[PDB]
Amino acid sequence: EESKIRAYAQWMEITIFVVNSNFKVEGAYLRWGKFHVPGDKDKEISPSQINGTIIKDEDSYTIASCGRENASSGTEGGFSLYDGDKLVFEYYWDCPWSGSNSDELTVKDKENYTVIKKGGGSPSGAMGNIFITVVKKSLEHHHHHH
């Protein structure tokens, strides 16, 4: 009952909201901690339950991970988002039990997508809530082919 309070003290929730296409989560993994149903750290889900998830246009989806009860140095992992067969971004976080939070968002097609993260990086204490927006550029607005 106090093993978990401790381990749960390092936690993140990442919400991906998308516009102008349907996108797919793939490549989710963890090296430390567990994934779980957002809002309920006692309900673990696997990478495989995340991978393949489609985020529909004008919807979001949240991934959540925290420390493992009586085990882990916090949470450390990542995932990738695709638009069909096109890799849009790779995300990675390392939020250790004892140490400084870090992350990294690698945008793979800046030309066709606007991808913006809020939260994340290197805050104190628990990693916390992180938000990524992804907008597939509309030619009539962005004129982004040339």
Author numbering: 9 to 154
From the paper:
We were able to determine structure of AfIP-1A(I20M, T135M), an insecticidal variant of AfIP-1A, to 1.8 Å resolution by x-ray crystallography. In the P21 crystal form the structure of AfIP-1A is a dimer with monomers consisting of 11 beta strands with one short α-helix at the N-terminus. The N-terminal 8 residues in both monomers are missing from the model due to the lack of electron density in this region, indicative of a highly flexible N-terminal polypeptide. Three surface loops, residues 77–82, 103–109 and 128–131 are also highly mobile with weak or missing electron density. The monomer structures are virtually identical except for the above 3 surface loops and the flexible N-terminal polypeptide segment. Superposition of the two monomers on Cα atoms gave an RMSD of 0.0906 Å (calculated with LSQKAB28) over 118 residues. The superimposed structures reveal a high degree of structural similarity between Cry34Ab1 and AfIP-1A. The RMS deviation between main chain atoms of the β-sandwich (105 residues) is 1.92 Å. The major structural divergence is observed within the region spanning AfIP-1A Pro46-Ile62 and Cry34Ab1 Thr33-Asn37. Cry34Ab1 has a simple four amino acid coiled region connecting β3 and β4 whereas AfIP-1A contains a three residue turn, five residue β strand, and five residue α helix in the structurally equivalent region.
